[PDB]
Design a protein around this ligand. Structure first.
Ligand SMILES: C[C@H](C(=O)O)c1ccc(C(=O)c2cccs2)cc1
Length: 581
Protein backbone atom coordinates (compact mmCIF):
# COMPACT_ATOMS: atom_id res chain seq x y z
CA UNK A 1 0.00 0.00 0.00
CA UNK A 2 1.67 3.18 -1.27
CA UNK A 3 -0.14 5.36 1.28
CA UNK A 4 0.67 3.99 4.74
CA UNK A 5 -1.54 6.67 6.29
CA UNK A 6 -4.56 5.77 4.16
CA UNK A 7 -3.97 2.10 4.94
CA UNK A 8 -4.20 2.80 8.69
CA UNK A 9 -7.15 5.13 8.24
CA UNK A 10 -9.33 2.55 6.48
CA UNK A 11 -8.19 -0.22 8.74
CA UNK A 12 -8.90 1.56 12.01
CA UNK A 13 -12.00 3.66 11.67
CA UNK A 14 -12.17 7.36 12.31
CA UNK A 15 -12.87 7.33 16.06
CA UNK A 16 -10.17 4.91 17.12
CA UNK A 17 -7.93 6.59 14.61
CA UNK A 18 -8.58 10.06 16.04
CA UNK A 19 -8.64 8.47 19.49
CA UNK A 20 -5.17 7.00 18.98
CA UNK A 21 -4.03 10.33 17.66
CA UNK A 22 -5.02 12.40 20.70
CA UNK A 23 -3.33 9.81 22.90
CA UNK A 24 -0.25 9.83 20.67
CA UNK A 25 -0.17 13.61 21.12
CA UNK A 26 -1.08 13.91 24.84
CA UNK A 27 1.86 11.54 25.35
CA UNK A 28 4.47 13.41 23.32
CA UNK A 29 3.44 16.91 24.57
CA UNK A 30 2.14 16.41 28.05
CA UNK A 31 1.37 19.94 29.37
CA UNK A 32 -0.35 21.33 26.25
CA UNK A 33 -3.97 22.35 26.90
CA UNK A 34 -6.69 20.01 25.75
CA UNK A 35 -8.34 21.83 22.78
CA UNK A 36 -4.82 22.68 21.59
CA UNK A 37 -4.31 18.93 21.22
CA UNK A 38 -7.77 18.41 19.61
CA UNK A 39 -6.81 20.80 16.82
CA UNK A 40 -3.65 18.86 15.96
CA UNK A 41 -5.72 15.66 15.57
CA UNK A 42 -7.97 17.21 12.89
CA UNK A 43 -5.03 18.58 10.90
CA UNK A 44 -3.62 15.06 10.56
CA UNK A 45 -7.02 13.35 10.42
CA UNK A 46 -7.91 15.63 7.51
CA UNK A 47 -4.79 14.67 5.54
CA UNK A 48 -5.51 10.99 5.86
CA UNK A 49 -8.80 11.53 4.06
CA UNK A 50 -7.18 12.94 0.88
CA UNK A 51 -4.98 9.86 0.71
CA UNK A 52 -7.82 7.47 1.58
CA UNK A 53 -9.51 8.84 -1.51
CA UNK A 54 -6.38 9.36 -3.64
CA UNK A 55 -3.09 7.72 -2.61
CA UNK A 56 -1.19 9.19 -5.59
CA UNK A 57 -1.30 12.66 -3.97
CA UNK A 58 2.09 13.86 -2.77
CA UNK A 59 3.12 13.43 0.90
CA UNK A 60 0.67 10.55 1.25
CA UNK A 61 3.59 8.18 0.44
CA UNK A 62 5.80 9.12 3.45
CA UNK A 63 6.29 7.38 6.82
CA UNK A 64 3.75 7.89 9.57
CA UNK A 65 6.58 9.37 11.69
CA UNK A 66 7.57 11.83 8.99
CA UNK A 67 3.92 12.84 8.69
CA UNK A 68 3.52 13.04 12.50
CA UNK A 69 6.70 14.57 13.92
CA UNK A 70 6.35 17.11 11.14
CA UNK A 71 3.06 18.10 12.75
CA UNK A 72 4.69 18.41 16.22
CA UNK A 73 7.38 20.83 15.06
CA UNK A 74 5.05 23.38 13.50
CA UNK A 75 3.03 23.99 16.64
CA UNK A 76 3.37 27.24 18.58
CA UNK A 77 4.55 27.39 22.21
CA UNK A 78 6.43 24.07 21.82
CA UNK A 79 9.78 25.70 22.74
CA UNK A 80 8.47 28.01 25.49
CA UNK A 81 6.56 25.14 27.14
CA UNK A 82 8.79 22.10 26.37
CA UNK A 83 12.24 23.60 25.55
CA UNK A 84 14.85 20.95 24.59
CA UNK A 85 11.91 19.15 22.95
CA UNK A 86 11.99 21.92 20.34
CA UNK A 87 15.57 20.86 19.57
CA UNK A 88 14.61 17.53 18.13
CA UNK A 89 13.12 19.10 15.04
CA UNK A 90 16.40 19.88 13.30
CA UNK A 91 16.88 16.10 13.56
CA UNK A 92 15.42 13.73 10.94
CA UNK A 93 14.15 10.26 10.92
CA UNK A 94 15.08 7.82 12.43
CA UNK A 95 16.53 10.12 15.11
CA UNK A 96 13.65 12.54 15.54
CA UNK A 97 11.42 10.04 17.30
CA UNK A 98 14.42 8.60 19.20
CA UNK A 99 14.95 12.17 20.43
CA UNK A 100 11.29 12.92 21.13
CA UNK A 101 10.79 9.67 23.12
CA UNK A 102 13.78 10.70 25.17
CA UNK A 103 11.93 13.81 26.28
CA UNK A 104 8.79 11.96 27.52
CA UNK A 105 8.45 12.68 31.22
CA UNK A 106 7.88 9.69 33.50
CA UNK A 107 7.37 11.89 36.65
CA UNK A 108 5.33 14.88 35.42
CA UNK A 109 3.96 16.20 38.76
CA UNK A 110 0.74 17.33 37.18
CA UNK A 111 -2.06 17.65 39.71
CA UNK A 112 -4.39 14.81 40.63
CA UNK A 113 -7.61 13.90 38.82
CA UNK A 114 -10.37 14.55 41.33
CA UNK A 115 -13.61 12.47 41.06
CA UNK A 116 -16.41 15.09 41.13
CA UNK A 117 -19.78 13.24 41.18
CA UNK A 118 -21.65 16.54 40.81
CA UNK A 119 -19.40 18.97 38.92
CA UNK A 120 -17.99 16.62 36.25
CA UNK A 121 -21.25 15.24 34.85
CA UNK A 122 -21.46 18.86 33.68
CA UNK A 123 -19.18 18.01 30.75
CA UNK A 124 -20.84 14.57 30.47
CA UNK A 125 -24.37 15.76 29.74
CA UNK A 126 -22.71 18.68 27.90
CA UNK A 127 -20.57 16.74 25.40
CA UNK A 128 -19.39 13.13 25.32
CA UNK A 129 -16.89 13.85 22.48
CA UNK A 130 -14.99 16.18 24.82
CA UNK A 131 -15.56 14.31 28.09
CA UNK A 132 -14.04 11.07 26.72
CA UNK A 133 -11.53 13.06 24.72
CA UNK A 134 -10.65 14.94 27.90
CA UNK A 135 -10.04 11.76 29.91
CA UNK A 136 -7.81 10.30 27.17
CA UNK A 137 -5.85 13.51 27.13
CA UNK A 138 -5.78 13.47 30.95
CA UNK A 139 -4.48 9.94 31.30
CA UNK A 140 -2.15 9.92 28.31
CA UNK A 141 -0.26 12.89 29.73
CA UNK A 142 0.34 11.43 33.16
CA UNK A 143 1.52 8.11 31.54
CA UNK A 144 3.66 8.72 28.45
CA UNK A 145 4.16 5.05 27.78
CA UNK A 146 0.60 3.85 28.33
CA UNK A 147 -0.44 1.00 26.05
CA UNK A 148 -2.04 3.04 23.31
CA UNK A 149 -5.00 0.82 22.42
CA UNK A 150 -5.71 -0.20 26.04
CA UNK A 151 -6.37 3.45 26.83
CA UNK A 152 -9.20 3.78 24.32
CA UNK A 153 -10.66 0.83 26.15
CA UNK A 154 -10.42 2.43 29.57
CA UNK A 155 -12.02 5.60 28.16
CA UNK A 156 -15.11 3.59 27.33
CA UNK A 157 -15.07 2.25 30.87
CA UNK A 158 -15.10 5.92 31.90
CA UNK A 159 -18.02 6.66 29.58
CA UNK A 160 -20.19 3.76 30.73
CA UNK A 161 -19.78 4.40 34.46
CA UNK A 162 -21.36 7.88 34.44
CA UNK A 163 -24.07 6.42 32.20
CA UNK A 164 -25.22 4.16 35.02
CA UNK A 165 -25.33 6.97 37.56
CA UNK A 166 -24.98 10.65 36.63
CA UNK A 167 -28.60 11.80 37.17
CA UNK A 168 -29.08 8.92 39.65
CA UNK A 169 -30.32 9.90 43.13
CA UNK A 170 -27.33 8.94 45.34
CA UNK A 171 -24.63 10.37 43.07
CA UNK A 172 -21.34 9.37 44.73
CA UNK A 173 -22.71 6.08 46.05
CA UNK A 174 -22.75 4.40 42.67
CA UNK A 175 -20.01 6.49 41.08
CA UNK A 176 -16.96 7.07 43.29
CA UNK A 177 -16.52 3.34 44.12
CA UNK A 178 -16.27 2.84 40.36
CA UNK A 179 -13.89 5.64 39.36
CA UNK A 180 -11.67 4.69 42.25
CA UNK A 181 -11.39 1.03 41.18
CA UNK A 182 -10.71 2.31 37.69
CA UNK A 183 -7.99 4.71 38.84
CA UNK A 184 -6.27 1.69 40.29
CA UNK A 185 -6.60 -0.35 37.09
CA UNK A 186 -5.02 2.46 35.05
CA UNK A 187 -1.97 2.68 37.27
CA UNK A 188 -1.43 -1.09 37.23
CA UNK A 189 -1.82 -1.22 33.46
CA UNK A 190 0.54 1.71 33.01
CA UNK A 191 3.03 -0.08 35.25
CA UNK A 192 2.66 -3.33 33.28
CA UNK A 193 3.33 -1.57 30.02
CA UNK A 194 6.09 0.67 31.26
CA UNK A 195 7.91 -2.54 32.09
CA UNK A 196 7.46 -3.95 28.60
CA UNK A 197 9.02 -0.81 27.06
CA UNK A 198 11.65 -0.63 29.77
CA UNK A 199 12.79 -4.12 28.73
CA UNK A 200 13.01 -3.41 24.99
CA UNK A 201 14.99 -0.29 25.84
CA UNK A 202 17.43 -1.93 28.36
CA UNK A 203 17.78 -5.58 27.23
CA UNK A 204 16.28 -5.73 23.72
CA UNK A 205 13.78 -8.08 22.08
CA UNK A 206 15.29 -11.34 23.29
CA UNK A 207 14.29 -10.43 26.84
CA UNK A 208 10.71 -9.46 25.98
CA UNK A 209 10.26 -12.70 24.10
CA UNK A 210 11.47 -15.00 26.84
CA UNK A 211 9.21 -13.15 29.27
CA UNK A 212 6.24 -13.67 26.94
CA UNK A 213 6.93 -17.32 26.25
CA UNK A 214 7.02 -17.94 29.97
CA UNK A 215 3.91 -15.90 30.56
CA UNK A 216 1.73 -17.07 27.66
CA UNK A 217 2.66 -20.63 28.45
CA UNK A 218 1.34 -20.30 31.99
CA UNK A 219 -1.82 -18.71 30.57
CA UNK A 220 -2.42 -21.16 27.71
CA UNK A 221 -0.88 -24.39 28.95
CA UNK A 222 -2.98 -26.23 26.41
CA UNK A 223 -1.58 -24.52 23.34
CA UNK A 224 1.49 -26.16 21.88
CA UNK A 225 4.92 -24.69 21.40
CA UNK A 226 4.27 -23.44 17.86
CA UNK A 227 0.96 -21.85 18.62
CA UNK A 228 2.78 -20.05 21.44
CA UNK A 229 5.85 -19.11 19.38
CA UNK A 230 3.38 -17.69 16.82
CA UNK A 231 1.45 -15.57 19.27
CA UNK A 232 4.64 -14.44 21.01
CA UNK A 233 6.11 -13.15 17.73
CA UNK A 234 3.01 -11.19 16.84
CA UNK A 235 2.60 -9.93 20.36
CA UNK A 236 6.16 -8.76 20.73
CA UNK A 237 5.97 -6.90 17.48
CA UNK A 238 2.79 -5.22 18.77
CA UNK A 239 4.47 -3.89 21.86
CA UNK A 240 7.65 -2.92 20.09
CA UNK A 241 5.59 -0.56 17.95
CA UNK A 242 3.52 0.77 20.84
CA UNK A 243 6.62 1.57 22.85
CA UNK A 244 8.03 3.39 19.82
CA UNK A 245 4.95 5.55 19.48
CA UNK A 246 3.77 3.96 16.22
CA UNK A 247 0.35 3.55 17.81
CA UNK A 248 -1.32 3.23 14.43
CA UNK A 249 0.63 0.18 13.31
CA UNK A 250 0.52 -0.97 16.95
CA UNK A 251 -3.27 -1.04 16.96
CA UNK A 252 -3.75 -2.59 13.57
CA UNK A 253 -1.39 -5.43 14.40
CA UNK A 254 -3.18 -5.89 17.74
CA UNK A 255 -6.54 -6.23 16.04
CA UNK A 256 -5.12 -8.89 13.69
CA UNK A 257 -3.71 -10.83 16.57
CA UNK A 258 -7.02 -10.68 18.41
CA UNK A 259 -8.63 -11.90 15.19
CA UNK A 260 -6.14 -14.76 15.04
CA UNK A 261 -6.52 -15.90 18.66
CA UNK A 262 -10.30 -15.84 18.34
CA UNK A 263 -10.26 -17.90 15.15
CA UNK A 264 -7.98 -20.49 16.76
CA UNK A 265 -9.21 -20.20 20.32
CA UNK A 266 -10.17 -23.87 20.43
CA UNK A 267 -6.51 -24.91 20.50
CA UNK A 268 -5.35 -22.08 22.78
CA UNK A 269 -7.75 -22.05 25.72
CA UNK A 270 -11.36 -22.48 26.78
CA UNK A 271 -11.12 -19.26 28.73
CA UNK A 272 -11.13 -17.31 25.45
CA UNK A 273 -14.71 -17.97 24.36
CA UNK A 274 -16.01 -15.26 26.65
CA UNK A 275 -13.47 -12.76 25.26
CA UNK A 276 -14.15 -13.72 21.70
CA UNK A 277 -17.87 -12.86 21.91
CA UNK A 278 -17.09 -9.19 22.51
CA UNK A 279 -16.54 -5.99 20.55
CA UNK A 280 -13.04 -5.02 19.53
CA UNK A 281 -11.41 -3.13 22.37
CA UNK A 282 -13.19 -5.36 24.95
CA UNK A 283 -12.05 -8.44 23.03
CA UNK A 284 -8.44 -7.26 22.96
CA UNK A 285 -8.59 -6.20 26.61
CA UNK A 286 -10.22 -9.48 27.50
CA UNK A 287 -7.65 -11.69 25.76
CA UNK A 288 -4.82 -9.71 27.39
CA UNK A 289 -6.26 -10.22 30.91
CA UNK A 290 -7.54 -13.78 30.36
CA UNK A 291 -7.20 -16.14 33.32
CA UNK A 292 -4.89 -19.12 33.15
CA UNK A 293 -6.47 -22.15 31.54
CA UNK A 294 -6.67 -25.48 33.39
CA UNK A 295 -3.64 -27.72 32.98
CA UNK A 296 -4.14 -30.66 30.58
CA UNK A 297 -4.39 -34.11 32.11
CA UNK A 298 -1.92 -35.63 29.65
CA UNK A 299 0.89 -33.24 30.66
CA UNK A 300 4.04 -35.34 30.09
CA UNK A 301 6.75 -36.08 32.55
CA UNK A 302 9.31 -33.35 32.29
CA UNK A 303 11.90 -35.88 33.27
CA UNK A 304 12.54 -37.85 30.08
CA UNK A 305 13.00 -34.96 27.68
CA UNK A 306 15.04 -32.80 30.00
CA UNK A 307 16.28 -35.12 32.75
CA UNK A 308 16.41 -38.79 31.76
CA UNK A 309 17.01 -38.25 28.00
CA UNK A 310 20.13 -39.90 26.68
CA UNK A 311 21.16 -37.01 24.39
CA UNK A 312 20.33 -33.40 25.20
CA UNK A 313 23.53 -31.79 24.01
CA UNK A 314 23.72 -32.01 20.24
CA UNK A 315 20.23 -30.54 20.42
CA UNK A 316 21.84 -27.47 22.00
CA UNK A 317 24.80 -26.98 19.65
CA UNK A 318 22.40 -27.02 16.63
CA UNK A 319 19.26 -25.53 18.36
CA UNK A 320 20.48 -22.70 20.64
CA UNK A 321 17.60 -20.46 21.74
CA UNK A 322 15.04 -22.74 20.00
CA UNK A 323 15.89 -25.56 22.39
CA UNK A 324 15.89 -23.24 25.39
CA UNK A 325 12.50 -21.79 24.50
CA UNK A 326 11.29 -25.37 24.51
CA UNK A 327 12.40 -25.87 28.11
CA UNK A 328 10.91 -22.51 29.07
CA UNK A 329 7.53 -23.33 27.49
CA UNK A 330 7.40 -26.78 29.12
CA UNK A 331 8.47 -25.60 32.56
CA UNK A 332 6.20 -22.56 32.51
CA UNK A 333 3.32 -24.64 31.21
CA UNK A 334 2.73 -26.51 34.48
CA UNK A 335 3.89 -23.78 36.88
CA UNK A 336 1.22 -21.12 37.13
CA UNK A 337 2.41 -20.96 40.74
CA UNK A 338 5.75 -19.36 39.87
CA UNK A 339 6.42 -15.75 38.99
CA UNK A 340 7.53 -15.04 35.45
CA UNK A 341 10.93 -13.90 36.76
CA UNK A 342 11.45 -17.04 38.74
CA UNK A 343 10.89 -18.98 35.54
CA UNK A 344 13.44 -17.02 33.58
CA UNK A 345 15.86 -17.54 36.46
CA UNK A 346 15.35 -21.30 36.18
CA UNK A 347 15.75 -21.06 32.40
CA UNK A 348 19.04 -19.26 32.93
CA UNK A 349 19.89 -22.20 35.27
CA UNK A 350 19.43 -24.59 32.43
CA UNK A 351 21.51 -22.72 29.88
CA UNK A 352 23.70 -22.90 33.03
CA UNK A 353 23.48 -26.57 34.12
CA UNK A 354 23.51 -27.63 30.46
CA UNK A 355 26.81 -25.90 29.77
CA UNK A 356 28.51 -27.72 32.65
CA UNK A 357 27.08 -31.21 32.38
CA UNK A 358 27.32 -31.70 28.63
CA UNK A 359 30.37 -29.75 27.38
CA UNK A 360 33.61 -30.64 29.19
CA UNK A 361 32.01 -33.44 31.25
CA UNK A 362 29.86 -36.56 30.94
CA UNK A 363 26.29 -35.33 30.80
CA UNK A 364 23.68 -38.02 31.52
CA UNK A 365 24.42 -38.82 35.22
CA UNK A 366 25.08 -35.28 36.59
CA UNK A 367 22.25 -33.39 34.95
CA UNK A 368 19.80 -36.22 35.75
CA UNK A 369 19.34 -34.16 38.94
CA UNK A 370 19.16 -30.71 37.39
CA UNK A 371 15.50 -30.25 38.48
CA UNK A 372 16.73 -29.97 42.07
CA UNK A 373 19.30 -27.18 41.31
CA UNK A 374 16.11 -25.14 41.01
CA UNK A 375 14.57 -25.89 44.39
CA UNK A 376 16.98 -23.31 45.92
CA UNK A 377 15.80 -20.91 43.20
CA UNK A 378 12.24 -21.63 44.30
CA UNK A 379 12.62 -21.77 48.08
CA UNK A 380 14.15 -18.31 48.27
CA UNK A 381 11.32 -16.20 46.77
CA UNK A 382 8.86 -18.38 48.73
CA UNK A 383 10.47 -17.63 52.10
CA UNK A 384 10.55 -13.98 51.06
CA UNK A 385 6.84 -13.49 50.48
CA UNK A 386 6.27 -15.62 53.53
CA UNK A 387 8.17 -13.12 55.72
CA UNK A 388 6.65 -10.13 54.05
CA UNK A 389 3.06 -11.30 54.17
CA UNK A 390 3.52 -12.35 57.80
CA UNK A 391 4.76 -8.86 58.50
CA UNK A 392 1.97 -7.36 56.39
CA UNK A 393 -0.89 -9.28 57.95
CA UNK A 394 0.65 -8.54 61.37
CA UNK A 395 0.90 -4.74 61.06
CA UNK A 396 -1.31 -3.71 58.11
CA UNK A 397 -0.80 -1.70 54.97
CA UNK A 398 0.11 1.74 56.28
CA UNK A 399 2.64 0.25 58.72
CA UNK A 400 3.81 -2.19 56.05
CA UNK A 401 4.44 0.83 53.78
CA UNK A 402 6.22 2.51 56.64
CA UNK A 403 8.48 -0.55 57.04
CA UNK A 404 9.31 -0.68 53.36
CA UNK A 405 10.04 3.04 53.32
CA UNK A 406 12.43 2.47 56.18
CA UNK A 407 13.76 -0.62 54.50
CA UNK A 408 14.34 1.01 51.15
CA UNK A 409 15.69 4.26 52.69
CA UNK A 410 18.55 2.46 54.35
CA UNK A 411 19.26 0.62 51.05
CA UNK A 412 19.47 3.88 49.04
CA UNK A 413 19.42 7.01 51.24
CA UNK A 414 20.72 9.06 48.34
CA UNK A 415 17.40 8.61 46.51
CA UNK A 416 15.06 11.57 46.75
CA UNK A 417 12.36 11.36 49.41
CA UNK A 418 9.35 11.49 47.00
CA UNK A 419 10.70 8.43 45.20
CA UNK A 420 11.40 6.45 48.36
CA UNK A 421 7.90 7.29 49.60
CA UNK A 422 6.39 6.28 46.25
CA UNK A 423 8.10 2.90 46.06
CA UNK A 424 7.44 2.22 49.68
CA UNK A 425 3.73 2.99 49.23
CA UNK A 426 3.55 1.10 45.99
CA UNK A 427 5.20 -1.96 47.48
CA UNK A 428 2.76 -1.89 50.39
CA UNK A 429 -0.22 -1.82 48.03
CA UNK A 430 1.12 -5.04 46.47
CA UNK A 431 0.86 -6.53 49.94
CA UNK A 432 -2.86 -5.72 50.07
CA UNK A 433 -3.46 -7.30 46.67
CA UNK A 434 -1.17 -10.28 46.90
CA UNK A 435 -1.23 -11.54 50.48
CA UNK A 436 -4.96 -12.32 50.73
CA UNK A 437 -4.71 -14.66 47.76
CA UNK A 438 -4.67 -18.49 48.04
CA UNK A 439 -1.18 -19.17 48.97
CA UNK A 440 -0.33 -20.80 45.64
CA UNK A 441 -1.29 -17.52 43.91
CA UNK A 442 0.71 -15.16 46.06
CA UNK A 443 4.28 -15.90 44.90
CA UNK A 444 3.34 -15.05 41.30
CA UNK A 445 1.13 -12.20 42.36
CA UNK A 446 3.76 -10.72 44.65
CA UNK A 447 6.86 -11.11 42.56
CA UNK A 448 5.21 -10.15 39.28
CA UNK A 449 3.97 -6.89 40.84
CA UNK A 450 7.26 -6.33 42.61
CA UNK A 451 8.74 -6.33 39.11
CA UNK A 452 6.54 -3.40 38.19
CA UNK A 453 7.29 -1.22 41.22
CA UNK A 454 11.02 -1.93 40.95
CA UNK A 455 10.94 -1.06 37.32
CA UNK A 456 9.31 2.19 38.28
CA UNK A 457 12.16 2.96 40.64
CA UNK A 458 14.55 2.16 37.86
CA UNK A 459 12.85 4.55 35.51
CA UNK A 460 12.95 7.40 37.99
CA UNK A 461 16.56 6.51 38.72
CA UNK A 462 17.18 6.62 34.99
CA UNK A 463 16.12 10.28 34.96
CA UNK A 464 18.32 11.33 37.89
CA UNK A 465 20.98 8.77 38.78
CA UNK A 466 22.18 9.01 42.36
CA UNK A 467 23.61 5.55 43.15
CA UNK A 468 25.89 3.36 41.08
CA UNK A 469 24.50 0.37 43.04
CA UNK A 470 20.90 0.99 41.91
CA UNK A 471 22.29 1.27 38.40
CA UNK A 472 23.76 -2.18 38.68
CA UNK A 473 20.44 -3.73 39.68
CA UNK A 474 18.41 -1.91 37.06
CA UNK A 475 20.77 -2.71 34.17
CA UNK A 476 22.61 -5.93 35.00
CA UNK A 477 19.76 -8.31 34.32
CA UNK A 478 15.99 -8.32 34.09
CA UNK A 479 15.48 -11.70 35.72
CA UNK A 480 17.76 -10.89 38.61
CA UNK A 481 16.48 -7.39 39.50
CA UNK A 482 14.53 -8.35 42.59
CA UNK A 483 17.31 -10.61 43.99
CA UNK A 484 19.76 -7.76 43.35
CA UNK A 485 17.56 -5.32 45.27
CA UNK A 486 17.09 -7.80 48.11
CA UNK A 487 20.88 -7.86 48.47
CA UNK A 488 21.33 -4.13 48.90
CA UNK A 489 22.04 -2.97 52.41
CA UNK A 490 22.94 0.33 54.04
CA UNK A 491 26.23 1.71 52.68
CA UNK A 492 28.66 1.75 55.58
CA UNK A 493 30.32 4.84 54.15
CA UNK A 494 27.07 6.79 54.13
CA UNK A 495 27.32 10.09 55.99
CA UNK A 496 23.99 10.90 57.66
CA UNK A 497 22.17 13.83 56.14
CA UNK A 498 23.07 17.01 58.00
CA UNK A 499 20.22 17.74 60.40
CA UNK A 500 17.78 20.40 59.13
CA UNK A 501 15.18 21.66 61.59
CA UNK A 502 12.93 23.06 58.84
CA UNK A 503 12.50 19.53 57.59
CA UNK A 504 10.37 18.47 60.61
CA UNK A 505 8.63 21.81 61.18
CA UNK A 506 4.91 21.38 60.65
CA UNK A 507 2.26 24.07 60.37
CA UNK A 508 -1.46 24.37 60.35
CA UNK A 509 -1.55 23.88 56.55
CA UNK A 510 -1.31 20.09 57.04
CA UNK A 511 -4.75 20.09 58.67
CA UNK A 512 -6.65 20.82 55.38
CA UNK A 513 -4.99 18.09 53.32
CA UNK A 514 -6.99 14.99 52.37
CA UNK A 515 -5.76 11.96 54.30
CA UNK A 516 -3.72 10.39 51.48
CA UNK A 517 -1.87 13.73 51.48
CA UNK A 518 -1.40 13.85 55.26
CA UNK A 519 0.05 10.27 55.22
CA UNK A 520 2.61 11.19 52.55
CA UNK A 521 3.70 14.14 54.66
CA UNK A 522 4.20 11.76 57.53
CA UNK A 523 5.80 9.06 55.45
CA UNK A 524 8.24 11.61 54.05
CA UNK A 525 9.05 12.71 57.61
CA UNK A 526 9.81 9.05 58.15
CA UNK A 527 12.24 8.80 55.20
CA UNK A 528 13.97 11.89 56.42
CA UNK A 529 14.36 10.55 59.94
CA UNK A 530 16.10 7.54 58.43
CA UNK A 531 18.32 9.64 56.17
CA UNK A 532 19.54 11.58 59.21
CA UNK A 533 19.68 8.70 61.73
CA UNK A 534 20.24 5.72 59.39
CA UNK A 535 21.18 3.35 62.25
CA UNK A 536 17.97 3.84 64.28
CA UNK A 537 15.95 0.64 64.62
CA UNK A 538 12.62 0.11 62.94
CA UNK A 539 11.25 -0.07 66.47
CA UNK A 540 12.65 3.36 67.43
CA UNK A 541 11.42 5.02 64.23
CA UNK A 542 7.96 3.65 64.77
CA UNK A 543 7.92 5.30 68.20
CA UNK A 544 9.05 8.65 66.90
CA UNK A 545 6.57 8.60 64.02
CA UNK A 546 3.97 7.73 66.59
CA UNK A 547 4.84 10.91 68.38
CA UNK A 548 4.90 13.15 65.31
CA UNK A 549 1.52 11.76 64.37
CA UNK A 550 0.06 12.50 67.83
CA UNK A 551 1.51 16.00 67.73
CA UNK A 552 -0.12 16.67 64.33
CA UNK A 553 -3.54 15.29 65.36
CA UNK A 554 -3.47 17.16 68.66
CA UNK A 555 -2.54 20.53 67.23
CA UNK A 556 -4.83 20.17 64.25
CA UNK A 557 -7.67 20.16 66.76
CA UNK A 558 -6.29 23.04 68.80
CA UNK A 559 -8.10 26.35 68.90
CA UNK A 560 -4.85 28.19 68.18
CA UNK A 561 -3.65 25.58 65.67
CA UNK A 562 -0.65 27.56 64.66
CA UNK A 563 0.45 28.55 68.16
CA UNK A 564 0.04 24.90 69.07
CA UNK A 565 2.47 23.91 66.30
CA UNK A 566 4.76 26.77 67.23
CA UNK A 567 4.91 25.79 70.93
CA UNK A 568 5.00 21.96 70.61
CA UNK A 569 6.88 21.56 67.32
CA UNK A 570 10.43 22.15 68.52
CA UNK A 571 10.07 20.16 71.73
CA UNK A 572 9.23 17.16 69.63
CA UNK A 573 12.16 17.67 67.28
CA UNK A 574 14.69 17.85 70.10
CA UNK A 575 13.08 14.96 71.89
CA UNK A 576 13.05 12.98 68.62
CA UNK A 577 16.78 13.30 68.06
CA UNK A 578 17.48 11.79 71.49
CA UNK A 579 15.02 9.00 70.78
CA UNK A 580 16.75 7.98 67.54
CA UNK A 581 20.19 7.56 69.08
C1 LIG B 1 13.01 -6.27 47.22
C2 LIG B 1 12.55 -5.89 48.62
C3 LIG B 1 13.67 -6.32 49.51
O1 LIG B 1 13.51 -7.25 50.34
O2 LIG B 1 14.75 -5.72 49.32
C4 LIG B 1 11.24 -6.56 48.84
C5 LIG B 1 11.17 -7.93 48.64
C6 LIG B 1 9.97 -8.57 48.81
C7 LIG B 1 8.82 -7.85 49.16
C8 LIG B 1 7.53 -8.62 49.31
O3 LIG B 1 7.45 -9.83 49.43
C9 LIG B 1 6.23 -7.96 49.29
C10 LIG B 1 5.73 -6.69 49.34
C11 LIG B 1 4.35 -6.78 49.32
C12 LIG B 1 3.81 -8.07 49.26
S1 LIG B 1 5.08 -9.24 49.21
C13 LIG B 1 8.87 -6.47 49.34
C14 LIG B 1 10.09 -5.84 49.18
Amino acid sequence: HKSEIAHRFNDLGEKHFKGLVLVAFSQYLQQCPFEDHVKLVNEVTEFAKKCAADESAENCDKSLHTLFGDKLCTVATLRATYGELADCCEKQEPERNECFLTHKDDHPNLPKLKPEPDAQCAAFQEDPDKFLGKYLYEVARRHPYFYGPELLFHAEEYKADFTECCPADDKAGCLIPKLDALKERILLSSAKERLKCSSFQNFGERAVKAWSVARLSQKFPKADFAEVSKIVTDLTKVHKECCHGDLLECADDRADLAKYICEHQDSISGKLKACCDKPLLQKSHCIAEVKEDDLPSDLPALAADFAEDKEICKHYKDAKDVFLGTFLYEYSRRHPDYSVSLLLRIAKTYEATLEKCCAEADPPACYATVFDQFTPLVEEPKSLVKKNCDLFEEVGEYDFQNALIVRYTKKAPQVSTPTLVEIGRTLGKVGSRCCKLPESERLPCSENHLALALNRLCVLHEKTPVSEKITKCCTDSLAERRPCFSALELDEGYVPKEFKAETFTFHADICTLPEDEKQIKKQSALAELVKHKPKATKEQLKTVLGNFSAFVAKCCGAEDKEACFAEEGPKLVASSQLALA
